[PDB]
Structure 1
């Protein structure tokens, strides 16, 4: 945002005094703007909203539709789960719930786990979901044809380092640099 500094500088035409630009403005006229209804092609349901546009671009298209990209999701209903997307600890219900939720939260694993329903299904950590998603993607790749454990070691190493009591933090960090 800012750090409490001078105000922004904005474009202006009527610097000087509209005696300079009297001619440059009088000789031209504006393109007629209109409040026009539009429907974004990115909308699965064809709802319509208003906004200001030039009345020569009316109803053309919504430039932000190109931001509507989505990441893929695997598919299985009756037999692909048993044949290819096999599992022995996760039910079809839990896998489908996790997959729909991952689409909800666009494979943002942390908030995915945050939502992961702990009372419709048994508890588990983020890296379990991450590695299971990797496994399902690998299986899909095979039919359609770095290490989670070290990440757990990560979480525990950071937890130990930070939970370290302040005096030990200072002493060890001294010991850290001395050698």
Structure 2
């Protein structure tokens, strides 16, 4: 008699063609990446209670040079910037990881004169350059192409005219756009075609 006893399809295919004792625990842990010794609490197994935190490696502080008072006074001095005016920039640099689209917005415009993004960037960069220059001799790569502010002030600007163009220059420009082809076709398809026809009729 047919043994079967299993699933119909599988059966036909086969025959027709013959204690955990690992207690988790609510646990205190200190993050070695912190300097304040703050104790937090965590949901860890029993077998790892006491190991160091695995998220302290995700702490790569952005590097920013730290000029000293003497050093600043000698070389970083700038007639248009005061020390109170310059230390603030680097503090914002560090607290915002050396990003200058968010350093600007939080600039202290009450004690401080209004600066664009480009001037702040150039200022911090000349400061970094001269900080490394105090070293210089210790192979301090005096080849730094510090951010161009002039060309770049422009380059910011000559995007802005093209940013807010309600029609014409956004719309009507299509015309001139097509003209780029026409101006690049019909002139040579004109003066050159004429000269070729003059030679062709000269030989003719």
What's the TM-score bracket when you normalise by the shorter of the two chains? Answer: 0.7 to 0.9
Evaluate the alpha carbon distance shift between residue 39 and residue 26 of structure 1 in structure 2; reply closer, same or farther with a 3 A threshold. farther
Evaluate the alpha carbon distance shift between residue 65 and residue 19 of structure 1 in structure 2; reply closer, same or farther with a 3 A threshold. farther
CA contact (8 A) 1:81 1:87 kept: no
| 2:73 is equivalent to residue 82 of structure 1 | yes
Q: Secondary structure at the match of 1:31?
A: coil
Mapped partners of 2:36, 2:10: distance in 1: 48
**TM-score, scaled relative to structure 2:** 0.69
Structure 1 residue runs of 5 or longer lacking an equivalent are: 1-15
Q: Deviations over 1:5-44 (max 9, x none)?
A: xxxxxxxxxxx99999999999963632111111111112
Evaluate the alpha carbon distance shift between residue 30 and residue 93 of structure 1 in structure 2; reply closer, same or farther with a 3 A threshold. same
**TM-score, scaled relative to structure 1:** 0.78
Runs of 4+ in 1 over 3 A off after TM superposition: 16-28
Q: Deviations over 1:101-130 (max 9, x none)?
A: 111111110110011111110001001111
Mapped partners of 1:43, 1:153: distance in 2: 43
Larger deviation, residues 29-38 vs 86-95: 29-38
Q: Deviations over 1:58-81 (max 9, x none)?
A: 121111111111123333443211
Mapped partners of 1:24, 1:92: distance in 2: 86
The root-mean-square deviation of aligned C-alpha atoms, in Å, is 6.2
